[PDB]
Structure formats: structure tokens, C-alpha cells
Amino acid sequence: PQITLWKRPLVTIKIGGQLKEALLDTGADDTVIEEMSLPGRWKPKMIGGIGGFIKVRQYDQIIIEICGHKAIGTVLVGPTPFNVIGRNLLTQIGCTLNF
Amino acid sequence: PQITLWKRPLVTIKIGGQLKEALLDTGADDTVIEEMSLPGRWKPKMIGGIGGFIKVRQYDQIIIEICGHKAIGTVLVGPTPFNVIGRNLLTQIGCTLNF
Ligand SMILES: Cc1ccccc1CNC(=O)[C@H]1N(C(=O)[C@@H](O)[C@H](Cc2ccccc2)NC(=O)c2cccc(O)c2C)CSC1(C)C
Numbered sequence: 001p002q003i004t005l006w007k008r009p010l011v012t013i014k015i016g017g018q019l020k021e022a023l024l025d026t027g028a029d030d031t032v033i034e035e036m037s038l039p040g041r042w043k044p045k046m047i048g049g050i051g052g053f054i055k056v057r058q059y060d061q062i063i064i065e066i067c068g069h070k071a072i073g074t075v076l077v078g079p080t081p082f083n084v085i086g087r088n089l090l091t092q093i094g095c096t097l098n099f
Numbered sequence: 100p101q102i103t104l105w106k107r108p109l110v111t112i113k114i115g116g117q118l119k120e121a122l123l124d125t126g127a128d129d130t131v132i133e134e135m136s137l138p139g140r141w142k143p144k145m146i147g148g149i150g151g152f153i154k155v156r157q158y159d160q161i162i163i164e165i166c167g168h169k170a171i172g173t174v175l176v177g178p179t180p181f182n183v184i185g186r187n188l189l190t191q192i193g194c195t196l197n198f
Contacts, residue, residue, distance in 0.1 A: 003196040005186040009125050024196055026108055027124030027183055032149065048180060049149020050131070069198065080149055084126060087104045095198035097102040097123055099166075099189075 001067075013085065014065040015075070020083055022066070026097055028086035031064075032076045038062060045076060054078055069093035100166070101197075112184065113164035114174065119182050121165075125196060127185035130163070131175040137161060144175060153177050168192040 003009050009024040016038065030047060042057040056078030063072050066085055071092035102108045108123040115137050131146065141156040155177030162171050165184060170191035 001198070005125060005189050005194060005196070008128070008186070009196055023126055025124070025126030026104060026196070027122050027126045027181075029107065047149060049151075050179060050181075051147060051149065051151030051153055054150050067198075081147060082126075084149075087107070090104045090198075093198050095104060095196055097104070097108055097125075097194060098197050099100060099192050099194040 010082075011067045011085075013067070013083070015062070022083035022085045024090060024095065025084045025086055026090065028084050029088065030074065030076050031084060031086045031089045032056060032078060032080045033083045034080060035077060038075070038077065042077070047076065047078075064089065066093050110166055110184070112182075114161070121182040121184050123189065123194065124183040124185055125189065125194075127183045129173055129175055129185040129187050130183065131155060131177065131179045131185070132182045133176075133179060135176060137174065137176060141176075146175060146177075153179065155179070163188060165192060 013022045038059045042059045045058040046053050056076040060074050062075040071089045112121045137158045141158045144157045145152045155175040159173045161174040170188045172187045
């Protein structure tokens with residue numbers, strides 16, 4: 001669909017069969033989500049945000065549905081203000097910016 | 100235009116007579132720019148994201164030129180790692196997310 005930006009672009013996503021609210025974030029290279037349980041091993045990763053760097057747990061090939069579209073990619077778990085859907089997954093659902 | 104998200108959606112903008120590179124950011128409520136001089140009054144503000152909060156100076160009714168467009172609105176100036184064009188200005192140029 002088409003999402004205008006007068007309000008935060010918050011959508012419903014599904015991870016591990018559980019529904020959650022997330023933000024479509026074109027300014028984030030990666031997808032960062034709140035603490036939750038995920039399958040498999042994770043590896044270390046540091047990301048730089050507006051306030052500085054933080055450590056997160058990186059889980060690859062995680063199945064995640066975004067507003068109906070299924071994607072399978074890297075998800076980072078850590079202390080984030082919002083569940084953020086970054087470019088790595090926005091590209092998977094064919095999301096683009098238009099104006 | 101239609102901007103794909105394979106890479107960071109960076110654009111050149113003109114603010115306060117200065118040219119700067121900036122990131123089109125749907126995850127940002129407002130526009131935040133690196134330290135620079137801007138006309139008019141301002142008030143302190145704290146904004147947070149990944150990594151925590153930073154203090155910025157809020158200036159209202161600031162004019163910015165972006166991709167052939169002239170947008171007007173609030174601009175926050177502070178120690179941001181990236182210059183980001185937020186929703187407050189993205190809406191003014193008719194930016195939307197599509198998939
Ligand atoms: C920018 C602004 C303006 C007004 C009010 C609050 C804020 C702060 N908002 C935010 O920080 C929001 N974030 C955003 O809007 C993001 O697009 C953010 C932009 C950015 C990039 C480089 C330096 C600094 C900022 N990007 C990242 O944090 C980011 C950047 C690179 C990789 C990565 O995995 C991530 C998560 C993600 S967390 C958030 C949804 C709260």
C-alpha cells in the first residue's frame with residue numbers, strides 16, 4: 001500500500017507467531033527489535049544510533065512478516081526505543097520512498 | 100521520484116545558505132542537523148533513539164531546500180552523527196513509503 005508520513009509509520013509485524021508493532025525506518029540500515037525469544041545461535045554486533053553505540057544480538061535468517069509480507073533475514077535484538085524495520089528488510093518487501 | 104532502499108537514501112540539501120548531505124529518515128519525527136548557525140530564537144530539547152538521548156537546539160520556521168523543493172518547518176541542531184530529514188519535512192515534499 002501507500003503510507004503517508006503525517007504520523008509515525010507504525011505497522012503490525014509477526015515474529016515467532018507473535019504480533020508486534022514496528023516502525024518502517026528508512027534511516028536504519030538494520031532491523032532492531034526489543035528483547036524476545038528467537039531460535040538458533042546469535043553473534044555480536046554494535047550499531048551506532050543517535051545517542052551512541054550499543055551492543056545487540058544478531059540472529060540471521062529469521063522469519064518475519066511485515067504488514068502481510070514475509071521476509072527472512074537478519075534481526076538484531078537489543079535496547080531499542082521502538083521495534084525498527086530497517087532497509088535490510090524494507091528491501092525484501094519491495095518498499096520504496098516516493099515523491 | 101522513486102528511491103530504492105538498497106543503500107542509504109542520501110540527498111543534498113541547502114539550509115542556512117549551506118549545502119549538506121542528509122538522510123531521508125521515516126523513523127525520525129523531526130529533522131536534526133549537525134552544529135551550524137541558524138537565524139531566529141531557539142529553545143533546548145532532548146531527543147532519543149538507539150544509544151540514548153542528545154540535547155539539541157530547536158528552531159522553528161526554518162526553510163530548507165531539498166531535491167528541487169522548498170520546505171519549511173522545525174529543525175533541531177545538535178551533536179547528531181547523521182544529518183537526517185524527518186517526517187515533519189518529508190511530508191511537505193510529499194514523501195510516501197510504498198510496497
Ligand atoms: C532523529 C530524531 C528527531 C526527532 C526526535 C527523535 C529523533 C531520534 N529518533 C531516532 O533515533 C529513531 N531512529 C531513526 O530514525 C533511525 O533512522 C536512525 C537515524 C540515525 C542514523 C545515524 C545516526 C543517528 C541517527 N538510524 C539508526 O539508529 C541506525 C543507523 C544505522 C544502522 C542501524 O542498525 C540503525 C538502527 C531509530 S530509533 C528511533 C525510531 C527513535
